[PDB]
Ligand binder design. Structure first.
Ligand SMILES: NC(=O)C1=CN([C@@H]2O[C@H](COP(=O)(O)OP(=O)(O)OC[C@H]3O[C@@H](n4cnc5c(N)ncnc54)[C@H](OP(=O)(O)O)[C@@H]3O)[C@@H](O)[C@H]2O)C=CC1
Ligand SMILES: CCc1nc(N)nc(N)c1C#CCc1cc(OC)ccc1OC
Length: 157
């Protein structure tokens, strides 16, 4: 299975200055739950911003850099390489990867951040005409989680 995994705001903002625009522990938990034991595929800029591979799953980085060889990370140099990865593969970001893969994935796991943030990177536009809502779950608000959010699982019609 090939899935997108993304958190975007009301205007599809996903990032600002190579970082996430918001702080939301519950969404980190969501990512951990979904992708532990599976595979994340991410672009070079996203990886470098994270700074190290995420524990307990396969980390795959897409880059043109022939010198990229990082401990605990597998490198790919083409989009076509993604389709050779076994198991459940999550396209993890950032903007460039989402733009390349939105028309190809089976599935999308989207956290809608119910606010409007300043961004410089965006998830591509999509229409519910193309996607069935398999599930929609309101995020619980906390002292630690203060931005309303909704976990959507969308399946390509
Ligand atoms: N909120 C969210 O759900 C998420 C947000 N983000 C955010 O997204 C932003 C980063 O996005 P963006 O700037 O697009 O960067 P990306 O993370 O998508 O990385 C882009 C890089 O990936 C490599 N790459 C992409 N496609 C190919 C290809 N076909 N062949 C070879 N290499 C390729 C290139 O690396 P190179 O130049 O080295 O060749 C390219 O410069 C950040 O702000 C981050 O915070 C990221 C993930 C999730
Ligand atoms: C944790 C944010 C997130 N949520 C969802 N639902 N999907 C995603 N693809 C992402 C992401 C990301 C990239 C990223 C993660 C991170 O913590 C692991 C720290 C920095 C990041 O990029 C700036």
């Amino acid at each position: 299975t090939l899935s997108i995994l993304v958190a975007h705001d009301l205007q599809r903002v996903i990032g600002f200055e190579n970082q996430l625009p918001w702080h939301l522990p519950n969404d980190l938990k969501h990512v951990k739950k979904l992708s532990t034991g599976h595979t994340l595929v991410m672009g070079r800029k996203t990886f470098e911003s994270i700074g190290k591979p995420l524990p307990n799953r396969r980390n795959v980085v897409l880059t043109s850099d022939t010198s990229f060889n990082v401990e605990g990370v597998d490198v790919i140099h083409s989009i076509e390489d993604i389709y050779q990865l076994p198991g459940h593969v999550f396209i993890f970001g950032g903007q460039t990867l989402f733009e390349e893969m939105i028309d190809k994935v089976d599935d999308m796991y989207i956290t809608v951040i119910e606010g409007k943030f300043r961004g410089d990177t965006f998830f591509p536009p999509y229409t519910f005409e193309d996607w069935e809502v398999a599930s929609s779950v309101e995020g619980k608000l906390d002292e630690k989680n203060t931005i309303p959010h909704t976990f959507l699982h969308l399946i390509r019609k």
